[PDB]
Amino acid sequence: GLVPRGSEGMQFDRGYLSPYFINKPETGAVELESPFILLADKKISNIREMLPVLEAVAKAGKPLLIIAEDVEGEALATLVVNTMRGIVKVAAVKAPGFGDRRKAMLQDIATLTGGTVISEEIGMELEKATLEDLGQAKRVVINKDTTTIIDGVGEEAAIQGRVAQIRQQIEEATSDYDREKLQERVAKLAGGV
């Protein structure tokens, strides 16, 4: 059952939330080098809530990938205007999966990238997020349908610890469907290292 080639990135089935994030027009892709990654468990729409961390990323001069339940309204439009005007290099995508599996996969991505989920479930405020809460990866490639995160910076021990947690859930699972969904998360994590 050997997989015959190495890691080529953690990929998930959500693509860009605006075609204006494309920066490789010939292929229709967004390619960001050494981006920060903002991870949030809710829909982002209020521009005042999103500004602090966007200003911090602009000041750092690095691209930003935002993975949130959705990014819409005034916040989405402000990202679009600033990207088109060349002020910031940003892209936003929906977090993958549904219900409690969406929360678990967003933490999978956090652990891979050394980020911290901004979770309103536990009272965290996006307005107060800082560069230390952002994950990082060597590169992110986004197209209409998918997002790939290559070489997340998370410590190896933490990534293995998460995998070990998922393996324990696989052992305790009571169906093939549930086991296969857990195994898919392990394959995704292995792909991002």
Exposure of 113 in the CB half-sphere (CA atoms within 13 A): 35
Measured between alpha carbons, how far is 39 from 115 in angstroms, rounded to an integer? 7
| CA atoms 85, 69, 191, 26: torsion sign | negative
> Token pair of 29, please?
């892709």
Task: Enter the DSSP assignment of 91.
Answer: E
- Those residues with Cβ within 8 angstroms of residue 133's Cβ, 6 or more apart along the chain or in another chain: 38, 53, 115, 116, 118
- Beta-carbon contacts of residue 142 (< 8 Å; ≥ 6 apart): 15, 16, 21, 29, 30, 31, 32, 65, 91, 93, 148
Q: Whose CA is closest to 188, among 9, 6, 68, 65?
A: 9
Q: Distance between CA atoms of 108 and 103, rounded to whole angstroms?
A: 9
- Please state the CATH superfamily assignment of the domain spanning residues 1-193 in this structure: GroEL (3.50.7.10)
What distance in Å separates the CA atoms of residue 106 and residue 89, rounded to the nearest whole number? 22
Bridge partners of 139, per DSSP, are: 33, 150
* Rounded Cα distance, 185 and 187, in Å: 5
Q: What are the C-alpha distances in Å from 5 to residues 33, 157, 161?
A: 23, 23, 23
- Token pair of 24, please? 């490789």
Per-domain boundaries in the chain? 1-193
Q: Which of 106, 150, 148 is nearest to 15 (CA)?
A: 148
Pairing mode of beta strands 70-71, 43-44: parallel
Q: Is the dihedral of CA 65, 58, 122, 73 positive or negative?
A: negative
Q: List the structure tokens of 108.
A: 């999978």
The label of the residue with tokens 């060349």 reads 86
